Amino acid sequence: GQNMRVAFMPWNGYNFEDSILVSERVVQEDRFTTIHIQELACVSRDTKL
Amino acid sequence: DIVLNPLGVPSRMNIGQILETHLGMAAKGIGDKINAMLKQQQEVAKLREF
Amino acid sequence: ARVTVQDAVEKIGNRFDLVLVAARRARQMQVGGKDPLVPEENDKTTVIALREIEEGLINNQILDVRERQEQQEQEAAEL
Amino acid sequence: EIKELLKLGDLPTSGQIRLYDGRTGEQFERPVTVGYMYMLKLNHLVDDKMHARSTGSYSLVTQQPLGGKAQFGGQRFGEMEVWALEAYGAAYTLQEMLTVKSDDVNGRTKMYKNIVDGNHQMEPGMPESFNVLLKEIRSLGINIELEDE
Amino acid sequence: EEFDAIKIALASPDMIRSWSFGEVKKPETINYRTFKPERDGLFCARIFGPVKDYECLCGKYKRLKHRGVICEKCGVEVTQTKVRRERMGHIELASPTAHIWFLKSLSRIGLLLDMPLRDIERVLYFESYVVIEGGMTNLERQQILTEEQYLDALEEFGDEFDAKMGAEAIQALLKSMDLEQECEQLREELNETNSETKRKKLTKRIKLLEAFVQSGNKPEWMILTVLPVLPPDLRPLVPLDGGRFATSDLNDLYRRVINRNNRLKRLLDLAAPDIIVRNEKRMLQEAVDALLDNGRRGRAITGSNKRPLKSLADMIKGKQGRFRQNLLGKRVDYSGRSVITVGYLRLHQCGLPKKMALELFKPFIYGKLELRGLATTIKAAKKMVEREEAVVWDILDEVIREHPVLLNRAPTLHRLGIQAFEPVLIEGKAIQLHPLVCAAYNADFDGDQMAVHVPLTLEAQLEARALMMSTNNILSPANGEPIIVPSQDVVLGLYYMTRDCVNAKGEGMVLTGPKEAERLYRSGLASLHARVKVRITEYEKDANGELVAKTSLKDTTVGRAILWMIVPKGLPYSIVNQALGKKAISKMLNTCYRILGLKPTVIFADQIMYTGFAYAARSGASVGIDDMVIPEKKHEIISEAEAEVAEIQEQFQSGLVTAGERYNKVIDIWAAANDRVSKAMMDNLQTETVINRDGQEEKQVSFNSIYMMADSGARGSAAQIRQLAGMRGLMAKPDGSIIETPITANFREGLNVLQYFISTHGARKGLADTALKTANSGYLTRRLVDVAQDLVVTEDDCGTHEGIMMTPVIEGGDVKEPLRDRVLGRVTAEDVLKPGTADILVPRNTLLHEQWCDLLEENSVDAVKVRSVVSCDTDFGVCAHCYGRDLARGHIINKGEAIGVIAAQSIGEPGTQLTMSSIQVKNKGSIKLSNVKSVVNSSGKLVITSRNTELKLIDEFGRTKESYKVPYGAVLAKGDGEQVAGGETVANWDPHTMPVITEVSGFVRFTDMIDGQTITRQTDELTGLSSLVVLDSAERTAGGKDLRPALKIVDAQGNDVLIPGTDMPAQYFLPGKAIVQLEDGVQISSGDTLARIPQGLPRVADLFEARRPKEPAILAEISGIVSFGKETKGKRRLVITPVDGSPYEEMIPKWRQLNVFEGERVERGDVISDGPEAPHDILRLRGVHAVTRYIVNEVQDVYRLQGVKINDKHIEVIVRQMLRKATIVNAGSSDFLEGEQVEYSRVKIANRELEANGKVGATYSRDLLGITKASLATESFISAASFQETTRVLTEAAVAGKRDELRGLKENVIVGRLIPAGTGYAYHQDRMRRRAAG
């Protein structure tokens, strides 16, 4: 994964029950951006019609 | 950039993360000194000593 | 009114009876186009009845009078 | 060793530092432990879990909505939450969970049409998951009827 | 369309033919080249209907030109394809075949025929003949016959007798037999011989024939001749996309039965030998059996995948059956799922993702879009929804509002698992939830998913707002304790604000209001924790609901003064002048609701959440490594603890000490070290703050972050900080024994490799049960809700007579549940009066709210009679006054609501959490004894000689404070009624020696004591003072075992000494292990002895199962003198001789200690044998009140041990349904001793004790049944059909021809009708008025 500055303190209840608060910086720096590759299939059969 | 709830530390009995956090700050402090002296280029030998 | 129904229960005396009277009113209030007797102030169909119960304008025995007089005068209209 | 490294790093030996708030810019009453920790991103993505079905696939033998997000099926309302509903006492909600939501061929179409016409009128009927049970029991050679009036 | 009931019976073959629209004779199903079904096949369109809507097979008639004509070219009626789901066909068999349900299940075909089950199978397999009719006297009806033995009958008689082979022989036997003759014959002869071992068998036969009497059900329909086939749409063979097919296994079974049925037809015209026709008929019988049930009678017939084929009986049986997976649990429409996340939101608000709302409310958007006129047609509506124009969001913001949406979290343990929430659109991806309701949902933001459900109809949108809204649910249904308590972060901020330090800032200043304290804190001029003087004006309602103000100056800190602008002008200021821990906040929220109301409480709770979050952020709390302090004495304590290990080890290697003593000593020293470390660790964590202010030095409370997080109760407890800092206790290996080597290190110092390997056992064992025992909890809750089906309130006050006793729980230890808590929510039974006589607070019916609770608390009352649910006399339900007030609402319960399911979830929710010589007085009080048999010992003190007496501690008020059981034959140091201070050993008795102390005094001579036949000559080797030894039956001579050795008390003349005041003899009989202490010739005094006789979750779950204990306690059913008859024949006998009545004798094990003797008297329902009490015997001997008191006192132990508080009314409601059966002992309207319902007994005596009859009815006996068995024992056949033993329930109901009145809750769930509870109850009153008025 990635490593970054980590604090330990409640923040207005946004980390109330195991919740995790992040920055706009990590999104801007694309630290946790990932790539997912899907595939699709178009079956073409010979129907009696 | 990331704030974690501290209440989940004692009750969950996971204190290795605190040591990991302190050691991470130590390593990043080393890095912040290293790049600081790298941007100034005091001496290669001085870097080799530090 | 809109957050709580605490004061609506005492006007009827039972929690379960709010729905069976408020929905009964709202049926005609929605499909029959009957004019509500309470200010609407940008509210839905299922909440103005509750706000009216919070005032207590209607009650189980007096829903069956304004509707029955209607068919009563229809009887004279028909014959 | 951590203390020696922090001394080498020109950092407080305690390991926590004083911070200012991003909103009002004041020092907090107590120093806050701040450092670096290896974060990870798990495979449980939020969009892989978000699903919603207003009216989609329907089962073959039971005529109920299908299951699974990939199949665009609806959520399963088990008997566990049925007990919660009947404990509350909201019978109309529970009735619509079993009649106009899943197993009324001639009921849910009307439920759609009248709400399209802005009429929240309930017109329930016999669940389709009970005709199957009656037919199966009758196929067992076990006569079963409904004693009407 | 509307019906009244559901009728279940057996299908006559004529009625099966009536249902059928054709006879299937061709086993083939569809063509292969074309894909149309064949004529008279398994999907024959003539029999079942067209494959496509309004289309015939060829095309002669179509397009609705011809409405319902039948195409003459093919024979197919034209109609909708829905008819294919309705139409059924039939299979015409050549040889009649036997149904498998009424043959293998238990017998229903064997009981009717009174034939052995094995012989029925032998006859079925074409192996043993049966004599249908014996024309001669040599043979007999229903005789087993072998082939060789049958040849003799053929050569002897031939046509005179009638004996053949096969299932049709059984059918002919059923045809020939007559049940009226059995009715008139068996009943008369049954009364002649009342053999109890066969009494139930004859009763069962009588019940079966009687049930056949009115069922109109001829048992000749037992043997199936025509078999119905399932509609093809329900056994579907559907083409797949890849040109493939797949079909239900039922189609394979139908093909299999048809294939051999037609073969059997072909074997008749071909004149097959009987040997092969038998084989074919066996093939057919096996095939039809497998069709009905695959793995029941023979090997489970599989397919090409060697997996057993699922028969149609399997389609309705078990968790995979329809009753559970398609009727009770259903997939739902207009619903979705997403992850959950924390919210700033208000308590009635929920964070919806803006993307899911348009999908869920899509029909609503379509409906309101045409009203807006923006889309002429629905197609354009859908098109612009797909484009997601800006207009749709403009419409959306009004569709969502004033429209609550249900939230769901799997699993739904209790009622609060589903709550309504007014949606709030969030431009995000996840669902935002209010933090304060997470505890009720048991949801943590660690990836948990929530289920969203939008209500459609007007009532549902109304029911959710009126009853399901989160603002309504503040108290738990289980108990009136609040459920919106702040969990972890709000309490931390509140604790930090409500803290005091003596050197912080701005100390001692006087201020004239809380508002200007807030500006001092915000400006930073004064610290948050600073003892100051503030002017506070609070409000009270001493008037008739009118608030009154009072202004005063209080000495407080700034943090608490800030809170006063948050309280809703209705609380004393002293409620916030503390540290305000978690329990303080809980009681604060309770107080706000109990004094002010609900809306003020909701607003206050929201503002507390906001303030707690804001000030927790303002403070800042972290977890520093320096915060985990380590005691300096850790190594010293470890060294001084292992020092004794060497001493223990050297003692063991010396041999003077044993291994068990070694283990005990080392574990004791390790426990002591653990306590020493725990104390030394907490010393440096609670008062570690050594700070001085205008002085020398002072010690205050700690400011360590861990110390606040533990003291405030936010997360963890002090029992965990020990593992943080001290050694982590001692771990036990999974066998049960605990390792003597403890984990001396903690997490801060790190652990050892061997230490970690030791500790992992506790981790695995702790989590393994959670991964396993939750299934047990789920099954228990499922069983509980079944017996809680029709438990709905029907009346307000049934006006029943007196009910249950009430008392505190002082037994055993101190007071745990006082009367202050156990009666809150009760209605009295009798006019309870204060200790001041003729002063009554109740007219036999009041609601015991807090005011009456305080009124009785101020008095010295200790016993109150309340109207219990068991005591309720309401039929088919309970009345409100017999239950008490609601717990979620606090008011008296109104009619309509259901209580059984509420209680079942109340007790079933915490189930997953609860998996695992001398008497000294403590306080000054009187020494009272209840039912004491007084006798004076040799030293002038008081001694006891009764087991049924218990010590009582009475204070100056009069109520019993403490109680301790004293056994029979103990020695006391003080008398009765002594007001002595605490710390006195009042009772002394040997833990093993059980004396036979004699109440009377006088000379003692050895009587009825002959040496060599019953006793042995033994003398002590040190003292010499000894006497003859009486051993048990297993050690004494059998010659003298006929008579029990009796030592009567004599005088100088030699006469029996009787009881003073009664003419009955007073002599003692010596059981085994009775060695006489004194010699012969010497005497004993009063109070002296003759001889010395030396001596989890399933735990609560098995009570509802009525599990018999392995070592039950035997009691007496009548009073009088107890005796013993037959000796040592399997088990001893116990003769009972009352004053007038009867030789009640039973098997009693002499191997277990007894309480009374031959010469002693015992009353009915008293402990004569020891061991755990059997609830069945408690019911049989003592009343239902005793057993329900036992159960409520028993099950409460586990929940008290786990700190879970449940209102006691949530147990006997189940117990009230456990006590539903009733066995009759009299007659007049029913059978001799058949089991009936208690309600049926009550209604049967509602016309014989009334004016309708003088006296003909019968008296009953209350019966108790297990939680599983009592669920089946209902007048409803469909309620139990959906829980367990579906095949058995169906086959039992079918032969009885039962009908269901649709009274239960799940009965209307299955049929889809309204649920007779609450709103459904008020709807059902109309239906009850309908059938009554014709």
Short mmCIF file of N, CA, C and O in Angstrom, two decimals, chain D residues 102-129:
data_model
loop_
_atom_site.label_atom_id
_atom_site.label_comp_id
_atom_site.label_asym_id
_atom_site.label_seq_id
_atom_site.Cartn_x
_atom_site.Cartn_y
_atom_site.Cartn_z
N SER D 102 -43.29 -8.51 -3.91
CA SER D 102 -42.66 -9.70 -4.49
C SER D 102 -43.62 -10.57 -5.28
O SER D 102 -43.34 -10.88 -6.44
N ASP D 103 -44.75 -10.99 -4.70
CA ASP D 103 -45.46 -12.14 -5.25
C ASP D 103 -46.92 -11.86 -5.59
O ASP D 103 -47.79 -12.66 -5.25
N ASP D 104 -47.20 -10.76 -6.28
CA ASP D 104 -48.53 -10.52 -6.83
C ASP D 104 -48.38 -10.07 -8.27
O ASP D 104 -48.01 -8.92 -8.52
N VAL D 105 -48.66 -10.97 -9.21
CA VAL D 105 -48.54 -10.63 -10.62
C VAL D 105 -49.52 -9.52 -10.98
O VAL D 105 -49.16 -8.55 -11.66
N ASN D 106 -50.76 -9.64 -10.53
CA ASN D 106 -51.79 -8.64 -10.80
C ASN D 106 -51.82 -7.53 -9.76
O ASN D 106 -52.64 -6.61 -9.89
N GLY D 107 -50.97 -7.59 -8.74
CA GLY D 107 -50.99 -6.59 -7.70
C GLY D 107 -49.90 -5.54 -7.85
O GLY D 107 -50.16 -4.35 -7.70
N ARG D 108 -48.68 -5.97 -8.17
CA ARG D 108 -47.59 -5.02 -8.28
C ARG D 108 -47.69 -4.17 -9.54
O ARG D 108 -47.21 -3.04 -9.56
N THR D 109 -48.33 -4.69 -10.60
CA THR D 109 -48.58 -3.84 -11.76
C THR D 109 -49.50 -2.69 -11.40
O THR D 109 -49.27 -1.54 -11.81
N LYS D 110 -50.56 -2.96 -10.64
CA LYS D 110 -51.44 -1.90 -10.18
C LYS D 110 -50.71 -0.97 -9.21
O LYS D 110 -50.92 0.25 -9.24
N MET D 111 -49.87 -1.54 -8.35
CA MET D 111 -49.05 -0.74 -7.46
C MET D 111 -48.17 0.23 -8.24
O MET D 111 -47.92 1.35 -7.80
N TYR D 112 -47.66 -0.21 -9.39
CA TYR D 112 -46.88 0.68 -10.24
C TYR D 112 -47.78 1.73 -10.89
O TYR D 112 -47.47 2.93 -10.85
N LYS D 113 -48.89 1.30 -11.48
CA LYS D 113 -49.71 2.20 -12.28
C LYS D 113 -50.30 3.32 -11.43
O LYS D 113 -50.29 4.49 -11.84
N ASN D 114 -50.82 2.99 -10.25
CA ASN D 114 -51.50 4.02 -9.46
C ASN D 114 -50.52 5.02 -8.86
O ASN D 114 -50.85 6.20 -8.74
N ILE D 115 -49.32 4.57 -8.49
CA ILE D 115 -48.33 5.54 -8.02
C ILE D 115 -47.81 6.38 -9.18
O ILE D 115 -47.43 7.54 -8.99
N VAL D 116 -47.79 5.82 -10.39
CA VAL D 116 -47.54 6.65 -11.57
C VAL D 116 -48.64 7.69 -11.71
O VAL D 116 -48.38 8.84 -12.09
N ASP D 117 -49.87 7.32 -11.39
CA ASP D 117 -50.98 8.27 -11.37
C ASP D 117 -51.07 9.04 -10.06
O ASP D 117 -52.08 9.71 -9.82
N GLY D 118 -50.05 8.95 -9.21
CA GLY D 118 -50.06 9.69 -7.96
C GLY D 118 -51.13 9.23 -6.99
O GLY D 118 -51.71 10.06 -6.27
N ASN D 119 -51.41 7.93 -6.95
CA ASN D 119 -52.38 7.36 -6.03
C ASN D 119 -51.68 6.28 -5.21
O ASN D 119 -51.32 5.23 -5.75
N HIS D 120 -51.50 6.54 -3.92
CA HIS D 120 -50.86 5.58 -3.02
C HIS D 120 -51.92 4.67 -2.40
O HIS D 120 -52.06 4.56 -1.18
N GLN D 121 -52.67 4.00 -3.27
CA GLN D 121 -53.76 3.14 -2.86
C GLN D 121 -53.30 1.69 -2.87
O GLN D 121 -52.72 1.22 -3.85
N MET D 122 -53.56 0.99 -1.76
CA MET D 122 -53.17 -0.40 -1.63
C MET D 122 -54.27 -1.31 -2.18
O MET D 122 -55.43 -1.22 -1.77
N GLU D 123 -53.89 -2.19 -3.10
CA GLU D 123 -54.80 -3.19 -3.66
C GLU D 123 -54.10 -4.54 -3.61
O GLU D 123 -53.56 -5.01 -4.62
N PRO D 124 -54.08 -5.18 -2.45
CA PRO D 124 -53.33 -6.43 -2.29
C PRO D 124 -54.10 -7.61 -2.87
O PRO D 124 -55.20 -7.48 -3.40
N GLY D 125 -53.50 -8.78 -2.75
CA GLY D 125 -54.10 -10.00 -3.24
C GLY D 125 -53.36 -11.21 -2.73
O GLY D 125 -52.48 -11.11 -1.87
N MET D 126 -53.72 -12.36 -3.27
CA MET D 126 -53.09 -13.61 -2.84
C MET D 126 -51.64 -13.64 -3.29
O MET D 126 -51.36 -13.44 -4.47
N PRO D 127 -50.69 -13.89 -2.38
CA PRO D 127 -49.30 -14.03 -2.80
C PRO D 127 -49.13 -15.21 -3.75
O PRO D 127 -49.78 -16.25 -3.60
N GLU D 128 -48.26 -15.04 -4.74
CA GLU D 128 -48.02 -16.10 -5.71
C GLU D 128 -47.20 -17.24 -5.12
O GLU D 128 -47.20 -18.34 -5.68
N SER D 129 -46.50 -17.00 -4.02
CA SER D 129 -45.72 -18.04 -3.37
C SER D 129 -46.58 -18.97 -2.52
O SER D 129 -46.05 -19.91 -1.93
#
